[PDB]
Design an enzyme around this catalytic site. Structure first.
Site, PDB file in Angstrom:
ATOM      1  N   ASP A  75      45.726  72.414  38.048  1.00  0.00           N
ATOM      2  CA  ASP A  75      46.776  73.256  37.468  1.00  0.00           C
ATOM      3  C   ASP A  75      47.935  73.425  38.433  1.00  0.00           C
ATOM      4  O   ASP A  75      48.088  74.473  39.090  1.00  0.00           O
ATOM      5  CB  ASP A  75      46.225  74.590  36.987  1.00  0.00           C
ATOM      6  CG  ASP A  75      47.185  75.376  36.130  1.00  0.00           C
ATOM      7  OD1 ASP A  75      48.227  74.833  35.703  1.00  0.00           O
ATOM      8  OD2 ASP A  75      46.864  76.555  35.839  1.00  0.00           O
ATOM      9  N   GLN A  77      49.798  88.593  33.261  1.00  0.00           N
ATOM     10  CA  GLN A  77      50.714  87.806  32.461  1.00  0.00           C
ATOM     11  C   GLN A  77      52.153  87.922  32.979  1.00  0.00           C
ATOM     12  O   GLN A  77      52.693  89.009  33.117  1.00  0.00           O
ATOM     13  CB  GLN A  77      50.603  88.211  30.996  1.00  0.00           C
ATOM     14  CG  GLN A  77      49.494  87.499  30.258  1.00  0.00           C
ATOM     15  CD  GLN A  77      48.076  87.800  30.687  1.00  0.00           C
ATOM     16  OE1 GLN A  77      47.795  88.998  30.900  1.00  0.00           O
ATOM     17  NE2 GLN A  77      47.149  86.831  30.817  1.00  0.00           N
ATOM     18  N   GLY A  78      52.797  86.800  33.247  1.00  0.00           N
ATOM     19  CA  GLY A  78      54.085  86.679  33.875  1.00  0.00           C
ATOM     20  C   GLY A  78      54.024  86.339  35.345  1.00  0.00           C
ATOM     21  O   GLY A  78      55.042  86.054  35.946  1.00  0.00           O
ATOM     22  N   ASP A  79      52.841  86.351  35.938  1.00  0.00           N
ATOM     23  CA  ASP A  79      52.659  85.953  37.339  1.00  0.00           C
ATOM     24  C   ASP A  79      52.250  84.493  37.489  1.00  0.00           C
ATOM     25  O   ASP A  79      52.343  83.986  38.607  1.00  0.00           O
ATOM     26  CB  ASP A  79      51.644  86.852  38.016  1.00  0.00           C
ATOM     27  CG  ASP A  79      52.122  88.288  38.181  1.00  0.00           C
ATOM     28  OD1 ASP A  79      53.324  88.480  38.524  1.00  0.00           O
ATOM     29  OD2 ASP A  79      51.259  89.173  37.964  1.00  0.00           O
ATOM     30  N   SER A  80      51.815  83.830  36.413  1.00  0.00           N
ATOM     31  CA  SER A  80      51.421  82.459  36.450  1.00  0.00           C
ATOM     32  C   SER A  80      52.403  81.589  37.249  1.00  0.00           C
ATOM     33  O   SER A  80      53.595  81.699  37.058  1.00  0.00           O
ATOM     34  CB  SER A  80      51.350  81.860  35.048  1.00  0.00           C
ATOM     35  OG  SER A  80      50.075  82.009  34.458  1.00  0.00           O
TER      36      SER A  80
END
Ligand SMILES: [Cl-]
Ligand SMILES: [Cl-]
Lengths: 237, 33
Positions: free
Chosen positions: A96, A186-189
């Site tokens: 990833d 969510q939003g830190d990916s």
């Protein structure tokens, strides 16, 4: 980032906001990290499905702290190319990782600077720092000010009791506290997990996935950068 | 039992798989909703 505190300008000069532009606004959807003046490191799932050789309406913002105020150090640069790991698995999130080539070079200064890679194969240890503009609770609100949180690393074997043996690959790294309350979300990916056990800051992980956020017994899961250093160097020109 | 191992779903703009332990492993993007 759940259970964190506010960052300061220049504290994390390698942190990027990865944004998509739409009518009336630029939308933060992922983090990234500065590798050099022309390349950022992010998660593969942040880019899967994009027009990799001709990405449209994608940009990074360097030197950002507070999204709702232009403080003067922000550098917005469109993304010109995406280099996704060719063995990325969109379902299980093996490999990833992606690179973003920028349409022009970043200008380095006190507030804008690369983060060093580890050596291939290095084992990160100690408390680590995760940063981003993700939600501050699971299913929650997103902060305008960059957040930081300190969390310990969790061994792959300990993490596999939570998520399953084959779900946590060696090339993943887990981080979180057993009681929960501290995590990316969510939003830190795509953003950074920074370690410093070598006596210096380096990029040890990339925010990837988890079950919810900050839950007891469910650490965050990150791509472990030391398994992919040779990949990064081969692909960043 | 929360989910069956190997199932996939989306959670808004994020993608999820059901782990061998029966929980949803979900990505951590921000979603414009
Ligand atoms: Cl501590
Ligand atoms: Cl801690």
């Amino acid at each position: 980032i759940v259970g964190g505190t506010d960052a300061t300008l220049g504290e994390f000069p390698y942190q990027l906001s990865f944004q998509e532009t739409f009518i009336g606004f630029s939308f933060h959807f992922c983090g990234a990290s500065i590798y050099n003046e022309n390349y950022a490191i992010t998660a593969g799932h942040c880019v899967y499905g994009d027009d990799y050789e001709n990405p449209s309406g994608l940009q990074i913002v360097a030197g950002e702290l507070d999204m709702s105020v232009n403080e003067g150090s922000e550098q917005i640069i469109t993304v010109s190319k995406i280099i996704l790991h060719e063995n990325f698995d969109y379902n299980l999130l093996d490999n990833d990782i992606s690179l973003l080539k920028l349409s022009g070079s970043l200008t380095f200064n006190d507030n804008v600077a690369p983060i060093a890679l580890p050596e291939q194969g290095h084992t990160a240890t100690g408390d680590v720092i995760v940063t981003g503009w993700g939600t501050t609770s699971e299913g929650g609100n997103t902060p305008d000010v960059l957040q930081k949180v300190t969390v310990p690393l969790v061994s792959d074997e300990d993490c596999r009791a939570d998520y399953g043996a084959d779900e946590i690959l060696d090339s993943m790294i887990c981080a979180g506290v057993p009681e929960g309350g501290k995590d990316s979300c969510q939003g830190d990916s795509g953003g950074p997990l920074a370690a410093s056990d070598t006596g210096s800051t380096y990029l040890a992980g990339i925010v990837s996935w988890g079950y919810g956020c900050a839950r007891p017994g469910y650490p965050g899961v990150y791509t472990e950068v030391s398994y992919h250093v040779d990949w990064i160097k081969a692909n960043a020109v | 039992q929360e989910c069956t191992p190997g199932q996939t779903k989306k959670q808004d703009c994020n993608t999820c798989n059901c782990t061998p332990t029966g929980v949803w492993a979900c990505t951590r993007k921000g979603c414009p909703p």
